[PDB]
Amino acid sequence: FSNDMDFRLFPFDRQQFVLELEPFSYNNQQLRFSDIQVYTENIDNEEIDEWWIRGKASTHISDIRYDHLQPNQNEFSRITVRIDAVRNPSYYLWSFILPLGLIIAASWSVFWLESFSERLQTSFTCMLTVVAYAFYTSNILPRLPYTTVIDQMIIAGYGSIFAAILLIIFAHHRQADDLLIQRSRLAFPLGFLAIGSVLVI
Amino acid sequence: PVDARPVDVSVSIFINKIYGVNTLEQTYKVDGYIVAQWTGKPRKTPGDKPLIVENTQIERWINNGLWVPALEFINVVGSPDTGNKRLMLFPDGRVIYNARFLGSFSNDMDFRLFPFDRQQFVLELEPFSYNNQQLRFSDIQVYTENIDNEEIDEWWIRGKASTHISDIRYDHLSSVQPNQNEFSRITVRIDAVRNPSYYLWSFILPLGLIIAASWSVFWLESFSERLQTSFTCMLTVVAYAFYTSNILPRLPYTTVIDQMIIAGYGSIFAAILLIIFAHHRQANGVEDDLLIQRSRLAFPLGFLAIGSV
Amino acid sequence: VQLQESGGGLVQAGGSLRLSCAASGRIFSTNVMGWFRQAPGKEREFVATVGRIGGSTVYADFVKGRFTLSRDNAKNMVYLQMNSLKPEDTAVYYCGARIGGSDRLAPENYGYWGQGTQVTVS
Amino acid sequence: QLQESGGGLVQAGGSLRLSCAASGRIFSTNVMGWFRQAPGKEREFVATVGRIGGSTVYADFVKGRFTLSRDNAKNMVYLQMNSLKPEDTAVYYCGARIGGSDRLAPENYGYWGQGTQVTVSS
Amino acid sequence: QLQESGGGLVQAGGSLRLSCAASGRIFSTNVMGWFRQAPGKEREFVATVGRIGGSTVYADFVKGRFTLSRDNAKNMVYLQMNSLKPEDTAVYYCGARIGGSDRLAPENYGYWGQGTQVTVS
Amino acid sequence: ARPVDVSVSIFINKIYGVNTLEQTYKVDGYIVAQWTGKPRKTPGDKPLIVENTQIERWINNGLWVPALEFINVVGSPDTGNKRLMLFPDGRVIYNARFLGSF
Ligand SMILES: CCCCCCCCCCCCO[C@@H]1O[C@H](CO)[C@@H](O[C@H]2O[C@H](CO)[C@@H](O)[C@H](O)[C@H]2O)[C@H](O)[C@H]1O
């Protein structure tokens, strides 16, 4: 069954699974739905299930009027069922988001190295570590035509490491002093989290 | 001794969704309904009201002499999945055929501008056995989905559905009676543009940061540092190439993203050459061409120059 | 996005009205707009909105072919031609915009409600 | 570059044989298609080769009167027109398919020639 | 922890209402089921809820004589037993399903209660 | 009694879906088979078209429609519409759409 599904807030997305039923040949002058009842599965423990069903099943009985079709014969009776569900973010928080945070955070440690050469070279290994991680994620997470929450973190990582590379070069090649601005070990994680906050609007 | 005019068939096609694009096979799935309406032989019906004949009961009416011509999808790949089907038989001879279908359709698709490509999804309809002297299409109406917000959509529809009615003349029909080798054809076209948001923010942007960062090797102080770091840059593009391949669609040609990957390889490789050249150019041992090593601006500009073409 | 309803008023049983909802702001189309109503004490209930497929329109079970939804995408408006009114139809008719989800009949999937237009049948 | 010819004035029911000469970078003649445009009206499709070998696509108004032939060696295509009518009076162009997937859509054709005038009088 | 009650002595043909109080991490009473064990015999299934809404699974000897209900408010289940016969004499236990893929399998139940004796003459 | 001469035409719309490991590929097209059978009566003594499910009815009554097998097809091909044109003089033209893995 198809429906309008929005996965942008993945892995914290909620979905409405819908069933729509209608007579194929008989309009509501010949066949009309009088009532609809829905019975679902009895759940023991939801921690093992991919989705969590929040609330009872909603139902509707409406009329669909078709322009392309005697008078009052262009209207069909329709049943609609809706099952509201919420994804289980557990797996994605521990195996995907958390390791990605330690990676981004770990990349902030380049400011604690005591040499331009060491700061700029280790940054490349950090960049390589985010790319290696983007493959691991894409190989498991679902395909979509838009970015998710995890995709934005990955982009944030790319931006952090790239920004740090520009700061490492500027500090060292602007003067001949350098080590003092490299004492931005606190200023960088805050600017990232600062931007990281305005991204959540 | 006077011939009978052709049977006119009015057609309405309802398109629910177009999805499941297979880039290599140049196919796509289409779910919808097809309605065909013509006037046949007058007949008796219960209470002289329109009669509804559904699914397998249709074949019982065919066996007893009801005429239901086969309409074939010219560009459907394989037998389409037919759901419910219906005949509405009127006393005056009118017949309305309504059926649900899901099929894989083929088309000419060019993805070289990916992810900024534009496609034309088509359905071609034609009677399987009756020529345009026996059966012709008189008109074709197309209806499509009412889109709320296309932001979450893989494809962005542009314009209303286009339609054509035309005659297909075949040169290899055994018998050769005058004007008996042409068939009526319906063509419907849906125009769409790919939503490139996901590919811009997750593929093109990081690749630009990776290639740009590779230009920082010219800011390292020792030749040994510039060379060994380039190999980390080379390894970073290879890593990205694998991440690309595993997600992008398979194609027999390079896309925009594929050319950026190639451009990063060349740049990094060209830098390895420039690094080695400057350090051995003077062929004396003190090769310290800092002037060319000061191409931290000229190398990105040389890159941007070659890419503009 | 801002919506403003209009066209209400008083009418006797069997009369007629034509409600109008003007959309102002960032809207992709009028397909996303739907009519609702709420009588005193009763929940806000769905009335009508466009269907998923072209040429189709979704109507509440109580419409019974009396109301008809129409739109002027140019003027960015939707109209609700109400005929054969009855006392039970008295309510405040709001105008919502589908904010997502796949339940056109669900008010929870609508927002940017207007101030509402009062309709009363005697 | 495309160049048409064969046009001319003719009485109702007469014939013409339009010719299109291709010069440059065209793989074969399968790409060329005949169009026409009358004063005021938009340019419309007339004929071109079909997808599968042996088939040819004609506009609904042709009604078997016109025939498309080709000479892949000389890189030319001919439109043998018969039983001409006043309604066939227009400028007949010769275009080359670029891409897309709609042999009948002028939007997917380019490299139009100057055209050739066809006039049918009574 | 689970605790049974409601057992006792009843005449052949009489009724009893067993009760099972549930305490602890139990989101719903669906996981609970009834069992019985006579001296010398193995613990045999009696009743638990069905997978799909509205269904309940009963042992083949029940034959419509027993009825499992639940009071999610008090977080409890009840086994209403009617038309009791001497064959039903046993200790009736209350268990909680702790995973597995077999509602009728004692192996998939833990947190058993002390049991409550049912005796029919 | 001489053998029946069958003239065959094959239209190939598409060749795609190569499977390298299994050494297979997909082909979509039509197969036309013409041959002359026994003379027969038809409505108005004109060429008669029989489509799909009605073909079987004719075989039961005596019509000879021999099965032509794709030697190198993998599994049953997906046969779409199929057709018989029956002439009073005995000519038969069998036409059918097919998609198969070869
Ligand atoms: C300062 C150092 C900077 C280094 C810069 C290096 C930049 C390298 C850019 C790589 C570009 C690759 O671009 C490549 O273009 C060629 C030639 O058009 C295309 O080539 C292909 O298409 C063309 C048509 O255009 C066909 O005629 C040709 O037979 C086929 O090979 C490739 O499909 C594409 O991949």
Determination technique used? X-ray
Q: How many CA atoms lie within 13 A of C89 on its CB side?
A: 28
Indicate the residue type of C11: V
Here the tokens at position A199 are: 């991204």
For the Cβ of B196 lying below 6 angstroms from any atom of ligand 1, the answer is no
> Alpha-carbon Rg of chain B, whole angstroms?
31
Q: Alpha carbon of A91 to those of A11, B227, E46: distances in Å?
A: 9, 41, 37
Here the tokens at position B98 are: 């309504």
Q: Are A39 and E54 a contacting pair at CB < 8 A?
A: yes
Distance of alpha carbon A85 from alpha carbon A162, whole angstroms: 39
Here the tokens at position F38 are: 């026994």
**F85: nearest CA partner in chain B:** B129
Give the containing element (helix H, strand E) for A91: helix A90-92
CB count in 10 Å sphere of residue B160: 11
Closest CA to B96 of B107, B86, B84, B83: B86
Interface check for D10 against chain B (CB to CB < 8 A): the answer is no
* Distance, first Cα to last Cα, chain D: 35
* Torsion from C-alpha of A23, A28, A32, A33, nearest 10 degrees: 70
Q: Alpha carbon of B101 to those of B105, C53, D47: distances in Å?
A: 12, 15, 31
Q: How far is the CA of B234 from the centre of ligand 1 (A)?
A: 19
Burial class of residue A114 (count of CB atoms within 10 Å of its CB; 0-12, 13-18, 19+): exposed
Interface check for B62 against chain F (CB to CB < 8 A): the answer is yes
Give the containing element (helix H, strand E) for A134: helix A116-138
Nearest-Cα distance to chain B for F52, in Å, is 9
Distance of alpha carbon D17 from alpha carbon E39, whole angstroms: 107
Question: Chains with ≥3 Cβ pairs under 8 A against E?
Answer: A
Q: Give the ligand 1 atom nearest the CA of B265.
A: 6
CB count in 10 Å sphere of residue D46: 25
Strand partners, B183: B168
Q: Are A75 and C65 a contacting pair at CB < 8 A?
A: yes
Block residue for tokens 């027999």: B252
CB count in 10 Å sphere of residue A111: 20
Chain B residues whose CB is inside 8 A of the A155 CB are 201-202, 205-206
**D50: nearest CA partner in chain B:** B168
Closest CA to D101 of A84, C59, E72, B107: B107
Q: Alpha carbon of D4 to those of A21, C46, D20, D41, D112: distances in Å?
A: 58, 62, 4, 20, 9
Residues in chain D: 122
Distance of alpha carbon E35 from alpha carbon E94, whole angstroms: 6
Residue whose Cα lies nearest atom 26 of ligand 1: it is B253
Q: Are B62 and F99 a contacting pair at CB < 8 A?
A: no
Chains B and E touch (3+ CB pairs under 8 A): no
* Torsion from C-alpha of D67, D68, D72, D75, nearest 10 degrees: 120
If DSSP codes are grouped into helix, strand and coil, which group holds residue D106? helix
**F95: nearest CA partner in chain B:** B129
Rounded-to-5 percentages of helix, strand, coil across chain E: 5, 45, 45
DSSP A73-84: -SEEEEEEEEEE
Give the containing element (helix H, strand E) for A169: helix A149-174
CA angle A169, A174, A177 (to 5 degrees): 95
For the Cβ of B7 lying below 6 angstroms from any atom of ligand 1, the answer is no
Q: Alpha carbon of A170 to those of A90, B208, B225, F57: distances in Å?
A: 41, 20, 18, 86
Residues in chain B: 309
Here the tokens at position E32 are: 């609970």
Q: How far is the CA of B263 from the centre of ligand 1 (A)?
A: 9
Contact F41, F68 (CB under 8 A): no
Here the tokens at position C98 are: 């589908």
Q: How far is the CA of B260 from the centre of ligand 1 (A)?
A: 10
Indicate the residue type of A14: R
Interface check for A136 against chain B (CB to CB < 8 A): the answer is no
Indicate the residue type of B269: F
Strand partners, A146: none
Residue whose Cα lies nearest atom 12 of ligand 1: it is B259
HEC letters along chain B: CCCCCCEEEEEEEEEEEEEEEECCCCEEEEEEEEEEEEECCCCCCHHHCCEEEECCHHHHHHHCCCCCCCEEECCEEEEEEEEEEEEEECCCCEEEEEEEEEEEEECCCCCCCCCCCEEEEEEEEEECCCCCCCEEEEEEEEECECCCCHHHCCEEECCCCEEEEEEEEECCCCCCCCCCCEEEEEEEEEEEEECCHHHHHHHHHHHHHHHHHHHHHHHCCCHHHHHHHHHHHHHHHHHHHHHHHCCCCCCCCCCHHHHHHHHHHHHHHHHHHHHHHHHHCCCCCCCCCHHHHCCCCHHHHHHHHHHHC
* DSSP letter (8 states) at residue D51: S
Distance of alpha carbon B101 from alpha carbon B80, whole angstroms: 6
Contacts of D75 (CB under 8 A, 6+ apart): D21, D22, D23, D26, D29
Interface check for F13 against chain D (CB to CB < 8 A): the answer is yes
Block residue for tokens 């009694």: F1
User: Among C55, C58, C101, whose Cβ lies nearest the Cβ of A62?
Assistant: C58
Contacts of E17 (CB under 8 A, 6+ apart): E6, E78, E79, E80, E81
Nearest-Cα distance to chain A for E53, in Å, is 5
Closest CA to B289 of B275, B278, B273: B278
CB count in 10 Å sphere of residue B91: 14
Here the tokens at position B157 are: 């529809």
Q: Alpha carbon of B274 to those of A3, B222, B280, B298: distances in Å?
A: 56, 14, 10, 12
CB count in 10 Å sphere of residue A33: 17
Resolution at which this structure was determined, Å: 2.5
HEC letters along chain F: CCCCCCEEEEEEEEEEEEECCCCEEEEEEEEEEEEECCCCCCHHHCCEEEECHHHHHHHHHCCCCCCCCCCCCEEEEEEEEEEEEECCCCEEEEEEEEEEEC
For the Cβ of B214 lying below 6 angstroms from any atom of ligand 1, the answer is no
Interface check for B284 against chain F (CB to CB < 8 A): the answer is no
Indicate the residue type of A163: A
Distance of alpha carbon D44 from alpha carbon D48, whole angstroms: 12
* DSSP letter (8 states) at residue E86: G
Q: Alpha carbon of A173 to those of A97, A116, B216, B219, B302: distances in Å?
A: 36, 10, 12, 8, 22
Contacts of F21 (CB under 8 A, 6+ apart): none
If DSSP codes are grouped into helix, strand and coil, which group holds residue D42? coil
Here the tokens at position B155 are: 């494809």
Q: Give the ligand 1 atom nearest the CA of B299.
A: 1
Closest CA to C99 of B148, B156, A148: B148
Block residue for tokens 């029909």: B173
Which pairing describes strands D55-59 and E90-97: parallel, antiparallel, or unpaired? Answer: unpaired
Strand partners, B6: none
Interface check for D52 against chain F (CB to CB < 8 A): the answer is yes
User: Among D58, D62, D101, whose Cβ lies nearest the Cβ of B122?
Assistant: D101
Q: Are A139 and B246 a contacting pair at CB < 8 A?
A: yes
Contacts of E105 (CB under 8 A, 6+ apart): E45
Residues in chain E: 121
* Torsion from C-alpha of D71, D76, D80, D81, nearest 10 degrees: 160
Q: Which long-range contacts (CB under 8 A, 24 or more apart) does B96-101 make?
A: B96/B35, B96/B36, B96/B37, B97/B34, B97/B35, B97/B36, B97/B37, B97/B68, B98/A24, B98/A25, B98/B33, B98/B34, B98/B35, B99/B33, B99/B34, B100/A24, B100/B32, B100/B33, B101/B30, B101/B31, B101/B32, B101/B33, B101/B34
Maximum alpha-carbon separation in chain B? 109
Chain F residues whose CB is inside 8 A of the D101 CB are none
Distance of alpha carbon A95 from alpha carbon A73, whole angstroms: 56
Interface check for C69 against chain B (CB to CB < 8 A): the answer is no
Chain A residues whose CB is inside 8 A of the E100 CB are none
Contact E34, E116 (CB under 8 A): no
If DSSP codes are grouped into helix, strand and coil, which group holds residue A156? helix
Angle at which helices A149-174 and A187-198 cross, to 10°:
140
Distance of alpha carbon B148 from alpha carbon C97, whole angstroms: 10
If DSSP codes are grouped into helix, strand and coil, which group holds residue C89? helix
If DSSP codes are grouped into helix, strand and coil, which group holds residue E3? strand
Distance of alpha carbon A90 from alpha carbon A50, whole angstroms: 9
Contact F23, F4 (CB under 8 A): no
Block residue for tokens 């799935």: B29
Backbone angles phi, psi at C30, to 5 degrees: -85, -5
For the Cβ of B273 lying below 6 angstroms from any atom of ligand 1, the answer is no
DSSP C8-22: -EEE-TT-EEEEEEE
Contacts of E82 (CB under 8 A, 6+ apart): E15, E65, E66, E67
Q: Give the ligand 1 atom nearest the CA of B258.
A: 35
DSSP A45-85: -STTSSEEE-SPPEEEEEEEEETT--TT-SEEEEEEEEEEE
Q: Alpha carbon of C9 to those of C15, C93, C116: distances in Å?
A: 11, 11, 12
Contact D108, D99 (CB under 8 A): yes
* Distance, first Cα to last Cα, chain B: 71
The region, left, alpha or beta by phi > 0 then psi within -120 to 50, assigned to residue B52 is beta
CB count in 10 Å sphere of residue C73: 11
Contact A118, A97 (CB under 8 A): no
Distance of alpha carbon B133 from alpha carbon B175, whole angstroms: 15
For the Cβ of B208 lying below 6 angstroms from any atom of ligand 1, the answer is no
Q: Are A44 and E54 a contacting pair at CB < 8 A?
A: no
Q: Alpha carbon of A63 to those of A54, B248, C62: distances in Å?
A: 27, 43, 9
Distance of alpha carbon C1 from alpha carbon C25, whole angstroms: 4
Q: Give the start-to-end residue ranges of the domains of chain E.
A: 1-121
Interface check for B158 against chain D (CB to CB < 8 A): the answer is no
Q: Are A45 and E54 a contacting pair at CB < 8 A?
A: no
By most ligand atoms within 8 Å of CB, the mutation choice from B255, B262, B268 for ligand 1 is B262
Distance of alpha carbon B69 from alpha carbon F3, whole angstroms: 34
Burial class of residue C74 (count of CB atoms within 10 Å of its CB; 0-12, 13-18, 19+): exposed
Backbone angles phi, psi at B240, to 5 degrees: -70, -30
Distance of alpha carbon B118 from alpha carbon E41, whole angstroms: 74
Q: Are B213 and A162 a contacting pair at CB < 8 A?
A: yes
Contact D51, B164 (CB under 8 A): no
If DSSP codes are grouped into helix, strand and coil, which group holds residue E118? strand
Chains D and C touch (3+ CB pairs under 8 A): no
Nearest-Cα distance to chain F for B26, in Å, is 9
Cis peptide before A11 (omega within 30 of 0): yes
**B128: nearest CA partner in chain F:** F81
Residues in chain F: 102
Q: Alpha carbon of B126 to those of A64, B182, B187, C90: distances in Å?
A: 31, 11, 9, 53
Give the containing element (helix H, strand E) for A123: helix A116-138
Q: How far is the CA of B230 from the centre of ligand 1 (A)?
A: 23
Chain C residues whose CB is inside 8 A of the A67 CB are 55-57
CB count in 10 Å sphere of residue B281: 13
